[PDB]
Design a protein around this nucleic acid. Structure first.
Length: 615
RNA sequence: UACCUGGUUGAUCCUGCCAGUAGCAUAUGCUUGUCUCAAAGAUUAAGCCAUGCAUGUCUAAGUACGCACGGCCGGUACAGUGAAACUGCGAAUGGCUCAUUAAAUCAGUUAUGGUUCCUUUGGUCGCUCGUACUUGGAUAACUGUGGUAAUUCU
RNA sequence: UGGUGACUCUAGAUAACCUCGGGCCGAUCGCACGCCGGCGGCGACGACCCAUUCGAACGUCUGCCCUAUCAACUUUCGAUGGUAGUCGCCGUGCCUACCAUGGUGACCACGGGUGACGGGGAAUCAGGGUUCGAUUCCGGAGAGGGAGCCUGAGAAACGGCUACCACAUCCAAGGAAGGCAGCAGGCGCGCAAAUUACCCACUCCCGACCCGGGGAGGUAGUGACGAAAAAUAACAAUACAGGACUCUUUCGAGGCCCUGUAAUUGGAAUGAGUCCACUUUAAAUCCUUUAACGAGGAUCCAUUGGAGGGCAAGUCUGGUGCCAGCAGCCGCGGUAAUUCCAGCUCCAAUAGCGUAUAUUAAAGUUGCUGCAGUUAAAAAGCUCGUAGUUGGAUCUCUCUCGGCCGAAGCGUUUACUUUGAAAAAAUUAGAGUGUUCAAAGCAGGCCGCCUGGAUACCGCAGCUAGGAAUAAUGGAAUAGGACCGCGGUUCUAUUUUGUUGGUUUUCGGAACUGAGGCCAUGAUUAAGAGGGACGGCCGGGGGCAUUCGUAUUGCGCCGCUAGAGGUGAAAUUCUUGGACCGGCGCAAGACGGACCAGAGCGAAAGCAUUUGCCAAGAAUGUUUUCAUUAAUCAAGAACGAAAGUCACCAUAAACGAUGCCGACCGGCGAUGCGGCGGCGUUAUUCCCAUGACCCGCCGGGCAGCUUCCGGGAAACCAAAGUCUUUGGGUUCCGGGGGGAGUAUGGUUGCAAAGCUGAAACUUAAAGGAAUUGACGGAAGGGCACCACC
RNA sequence: UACUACCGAUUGGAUGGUUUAGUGAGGCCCUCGGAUCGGCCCCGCCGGGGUGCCCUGGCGGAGCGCUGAGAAGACGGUCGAACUUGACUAUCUAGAGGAAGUA
């Protein structure tokens, strides 16, 4: 500004701008216009009495809501001028913890002073990291019931204990109501974390759920649920999705009075049929037995670790018959494969994009930057939905949370979703490439069977039969389309619903065009050896199948590549030219490849799990 | 400990910089057993501030009619200890920060014979030629009636 | 009366005044009790004034970073000063009234910037320096921004008040309250920084006070900012186809001494820990002291960076194949990678070690010490010329008193030098002292004593006293000079007349004027510094006038006849409307060949026919004159090739690619000018006198040759020397290559242009001398019937 | 295929700094003002004392009596934050268009 007064003036203008921005970010929450501050509470150990946490945290004015088992409630205090909403959950109840941690804004962990955290606490913590965290806070309990010499150092011991998991996070004390007030002041004034999945999409909670039946004998009626809008500006036309119970249309919004505002019934919008979202997922015109199975799985993965894709030679059936749909590639990287070569009936039921990042950035700029005049954020709205069963209301009366989010355009349809995942080092049990896994893919809950393929950059990808202990594998399956970014979780049912955390990753670009190709490798021992040429037995046992396998390539384990010349024996006895020299201990191998596709096994039901234990 | 070394050419000698070298300060990375001392929201934002605390004070010796407690011994003005309140003093020191400020601030040197100064210390305090063996009206604390959604309001 | 260096001071004397918003001159309280109804002893609280203490406030002198792309500012509306006031605690344009027109500035005013609070201090350091100082001591300022106040000894106070501006809280909507740049704490901001802990026990502060209070302060917590100490093993016995030592020719022999990459054997010693107790402390913790436990792969496990060079340490092994990557720089990597990715081994520092950025040394690459400018970056076109800077020799202590010394003067005035006193502590240097050593601390040491708690440094400016070389400055040249006595004019000290009254002089002191005596009466020399005269010369120096010469162009005439021109070649152009040619005559603008020189002159551009006029000038000669007048030069000015423009323009390989002035340092022969001598030739018939030659000498000049003077990177240079053995005076100017002499601003010019003049960004070289080769359609030589004749 | 930065109209809007002109919160000073509160008088009802009179003693009443104290408020002056309109200047932001280089 080239003057000492104008430089100070310019710096004060910039400080005024930046302060306006920061105050506009910190105005959205817990005040006179914003939604309540939602604090999920989890004790990470068994010894931690959560009633002792709630009876300390209660004082403000307690507006005690209640469910069938939990004591979740709204705490209100205009001394701090802040309106909270305290919710509680049990460590291991996955269908509650991971399903309302995705709507809460603060997670309050509790930790005993002696042990860091329980094994079940480590389990739910390892789920919650991969699920996506809001701003969390740590607290202890047993420093007050401890001699004062030990309170000097138990703080230090737990600080070095949790540094593996939370590397820079102070601990607090929750023992007195002054300490609880200091904790609430910590929660109220703290810089937030913005989960972009929750930030770019509109989502809600339900505080007052009412069910009215259209037909009681149909067991499908109308829910009158009530909650504060926490995402974007709500629209009645977009699709609604209760998270564990599929998606269906929503018909009517109205704005009643707030139950408990910080300072002490009209209809807004309806939906004509042209404005409403279409309900078309697909194109309309298209004891010792299981123990022996897991031992066979053990011997299979121990077979598939020193051998890539070895299989026994089919002697009863000709090799051109059992491998009718294969081919031998010169190179997986260079020799291509046509996408319009093999197409099943499932591809005539899925939708596709002319360009994916174009429609992604346009729906980003059309929902984020643009202002629609629907139901605004922070409003205590009451939701009239079109059709909904009664079992959701029964599980509401039990104590399960009910959240819902507004779908975007091109988010109810069908495509082939992609996600790069990795293996959890907690459960080391292997898993085949075609089994069924529980999906937690961007607020959703279903089950399907993907294809576990490798993580490379080429269009062609080699299928893997199992999972790797360190390397990042990719799954590929038909699923309802949901735009990136979204954290994904894949579980398996160990026993009675005790879900096994095995696959923790994120979602990659959904496209049905990334091709996965399954190889098959056959074996045979060479037993007549000459210079740069040999004759192998046990490779095949017919003769014309080799004439069907003329242009395929051959290789040995020691890099000796080659191809056949002429099968001189009526069995698999070939003249085999090679670019190098063959050894008697070596074994020649070919690779025959085919492109695979997953199967249609999406079911929206997930079993309500038993709480997980350390067996 | 008054010090140089690599790099222009086919090879040479130069000019000349670039890079290396050592300390010192702020940050940051990885690592960390013992013990002594020890800096620490200056740099950007002399930006904004929940809550608590940071300044009060009585001796034999200004004013005690609070039974607040005891207590003479009981006509016995006031035994005593004493909250409150009036009075007096302190709150202009300390603590923090470095925005402003360029003969300004500040440093050394001089001066007030050109000023003011609570306190301390010493001097002075029948030096004046003109009801007193004691003067007058109030007001707090206290008692009692209240107002205001709300204040260390009244 | 008393004092000061100095009063319009202090004290005294007189005449009054003495503010109702009044000045002091005691209507106050405790303790011990009393002596002969009176007279009382200690205190406490007061109180005008004076002094003191703690200050404060206004002044004095010297001192500060960058900027001229800030050169004039200040003065209307106080700027500088005078007079009288007003206001103030007082001095003052502090304010008012009336006057004066001042005050500051290239010795940098005014304006702007500062990632500026100032010092004490800090880091680095041969010496000199450079950078930092928000930060615990001192001084200032400010409590969101400005402003105004009350109370008070003291505040323009903010943990006081009143507004406005900006924010912001409670509300029943009427109103009410606010100020963390105190301690914590939060948000924000960011690369960047700790506990909403305990206590008045220590140090001190405040209060009516031995008693109360203190986020001042102390104590813990977090704390790899940083500084000090210091573990991660020691030893013995075995064994080594170790090593060295004594004998053996050698083998090989030794309690001879050391070593190990021996998970060889062995018990010995300990802290880290765990943990009673004491001690510590306000209470605790920590440390120190002690129980008991606590080590063999003593797994009670040391890390961070490297291994081509710089630079200590592997062209070992596998993977990779100009990819991935490494590499501050040079570089490594393209299928054998000493450099990537790993293993193994090795190196350095070690409870620490990498990286980024600021900064210092290295940097004699900012140069005062101490650099550079021919060719590497660079010296102005030339002369004049203000400030600034620098400047030749020369000159060997006394007067009245107070006790033979001091008080009274200094001696022209400074700089310089040495001394003294005055200069906060801390920090730094440094003395003493076994914190168990050390960084520290200021304590400690003997058997109540004994002893510390030093000292130095503290630039510059200002005080004091000695010195008197160096360097400035003064004093007598119209004598208004000194030292003397004598004289005259005016005023005056107060001693003088037993006292008083008055006159009067003297004495003594000033201020002014006349004559006389006296002094060796008084001017340093005349620079191988500089001006200026004079003398005879000299020159393409300049201006004006004048004179000649050929050539060219055009014209007049005559003769001749078809070509004339230009190139490697034509091309272009004029001719029987007789071109070109040859001869004769006329005019016009010019221009001055050869003679013309490694000659001359001029400040530089530059200057050539004869003659005359005008005004200059160098050198030489001088026993002339003045007597430091000088050198270099910002600012400022005069002339300035050639191109360009309506007189301007002021620019060049403007080139010796080379500031100016001064001294010293080798030879040799020519030349130009002037002067001095000398055999002998010529000319003026002799004779001198001169001219032309010849042999020298002297002085400046233009040049050249030469050289182990000494330089220099060398080419080269008698200056480009007298340079690490570095200082004669002074000007301009350079700081790796580009961007770029570009953009913008200012300024001059009609304009072209002139002067001034960056940054972003890019880059590891660009560049100079010299040496070996390579080349040709450059020029010279030698040679071969696998060349020619 | 995209960036970069300029002009940039909008005299966008907003904010800051110098000044012209106009306005002027609040305190302080001055000239007034006088809501209220006292005292001294003048009587009435009247004791004691001295002697119908005076001093005390209690009231009560009124008098524009005559004085003391005195708040709100207002004229003026001063200091003076701030406000408005200009002019100049600076910055932050919304902004069409484009160009060149950047690769």
């Amino acid at each position: 500004e080239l003057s000492r007064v104008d430089q100070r003036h310019r710096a004060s203008q910039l400080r005024k701008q930046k302060k306006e921005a920061v105050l506009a970010e910190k105005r959205q929450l817990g005040g006179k216009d914003g939604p309540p501050h939602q604090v999920l509470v989890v004790p990470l150990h068994s010894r931690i009495s959560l009633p002792e946490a709630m009876q300390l945290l209660q004082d403000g004015t307690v507006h005690l809501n209640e469910l069938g088992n939990t004591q979740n409630f709204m705490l209100l205090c205009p001394r701090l001028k802040h309106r909270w909403f305290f919710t509680s959950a049990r460590p291991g109840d996955l269908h509650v913890v991971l399903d309302m941690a995705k709507v809460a804004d603060t997670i309050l962990f509790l930790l005993d002073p002696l042990e860091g955290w329980d094994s079940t606490g480590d389990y739910c913590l390892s789920c919650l990291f991969a699920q996506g965290l809001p701003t969390y806070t740590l607290a202890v309990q047993g420093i007050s019931g401890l001699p004062l010499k030990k309170q000097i150092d138990t703080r230090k011991k737990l600080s070095k204990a949790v540094e593996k998991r939370f590397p820079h996070d102070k601990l607090l004390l929750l023992d007195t109501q002054q300490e609880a007030g200091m904790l609430l002041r910590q929660l109220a004034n703290q810089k937030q974390q913005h989960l972009a999945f929750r930030d770019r999409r509109a989502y809600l909670f339900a505080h007052a759920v009412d069910f009215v039946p259209s037909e009681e004998n149909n067991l499908v009626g109308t829910l009158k649920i009530s909650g504060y809008v926490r995402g974007q500006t709500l629209n009645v036309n977009r699709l609604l999705h209760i998270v564990g119970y599929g998606d269906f249309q929503m018909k009517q919004i109205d704005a009643p009075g707030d139950p408990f505002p910080l300072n002490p019934k009209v209809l807004m919008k309806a939906d004509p049929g042209r404005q409403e979202s279409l309900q078309a997922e697909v194109i309309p015109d298209p004891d010792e037995e299981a123990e022996a199975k897991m031992l066979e799985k053990y011997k299979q993965e121990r077979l598939e670790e020193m051998f890539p894709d070895e299989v026994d030679t089919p002697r009863d059936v000709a090799a051109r018959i059992r491998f009718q749909k294969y081919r031998g590639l010169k190179s997986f990287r260079t020799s291509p494969w046509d996408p319009k070569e093999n197409l099943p009936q499932d591809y005539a039921r899925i939708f596709q994009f002319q360009n994916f990042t174009n429609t992604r950035k346009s729906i980003f700029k059309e929902v984020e930057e643009k202002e629609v005049e629907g139901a605004e954020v922070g409003w205590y709205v009451t939701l009239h939905v079109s059709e909904v069963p009664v079992s959701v209301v029964e599980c509401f009366r039990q104590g399960t949370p009910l959240i819902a989010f507004s779908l975007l355009p091109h988010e109810q349809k069908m495509s082939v979703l992609n996600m790069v995942v990795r293996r959890d080092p907690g459960n080391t049990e292997p898993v085949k490439a075609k089994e069924e896994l529980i999906f937690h893919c961007g607020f959703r809950r279903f089950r399907a069977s993907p294809l576990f393929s490798q993580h490379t950059a080429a269009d062609k990808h080699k299928l893997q039969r199992f999972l790797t202990a360190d390397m990042a594998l990719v799954a590929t399956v038909y699923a309802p389309i949901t735009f990136p970014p979204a954290s994904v979780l894949l579980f398996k049912q160990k026993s009675n619903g005790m879900h096994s955390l095995i696959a923790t990753g994120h979602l990659m670009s959904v496209d049905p065009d990334r091709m996965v190709i399954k190889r098959v490798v056959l074996s045979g021992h060479p037993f007549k050896i000459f210079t740069k040429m040999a004759v192998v037995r046990y490779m095949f046992f017919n003769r014309e199948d080799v004439l069907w396998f003329k242009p395929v390539e051959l290789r040995t384990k020691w890099g000796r590549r080659g191809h056949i010349k002429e099968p001189l024996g009526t069995h698999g006895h070939m003249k085999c030219s090679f670019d190098g020299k063959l050894k008697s201990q070596d074994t020649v191998l070919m690779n025959l490849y085919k492109r695979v596709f997953p199967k249609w096994t999406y079911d929206p039901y997930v079993p309500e799990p038993v709480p997980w234990l350390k067996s």
